[PDB]
Amino acid sequence: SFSGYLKLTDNVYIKNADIVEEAKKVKPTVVVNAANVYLKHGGGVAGALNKATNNAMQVESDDYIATNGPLKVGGSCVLSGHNLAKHCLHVVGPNVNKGEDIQLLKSAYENFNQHEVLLAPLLSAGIFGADPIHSLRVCVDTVRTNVYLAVFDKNLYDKLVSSFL
């Protein structure tokens, strides 16, 4: 199972790790993707997860969008995890750089509660423009299931751990 995580709360764990390498090692039941409403996995965690699937994630996602239309900001869908996990839970956090409402971050994290255990990134962090310290706060105050957070950036990981509470 998961190793090298620092326990933040009873159910939230954190590690300085590349979520792709973590997914390949662990092969969790659920890996969370930091998705957009169109499931266009271009950059950040989405681009990296998609590239690890040899673009199979993007092919599957385009078929999902063709059938269902875009997701809502704050929403999610369960698709295949491909070579990385049993499932990928594509979660759309608000993109602050697109003027999206940061209050939707709690709605985005609520999707994690439908899964007993997940490997995940901080939502709305990185290219989504939100404050990662605030994202971690929303995560611990919203998610009740077991969430293993992979934080790629060491400097951000240290800042998150040292400022937690």
Ligand SMILES: NC(=O)N1CCC(C(=O)O)CC1
């Ligand atoms: N979603 C996304 O691309 N990112 C958010 C999480 C960041 C991290 O873990 O240091 C990397 C960038």
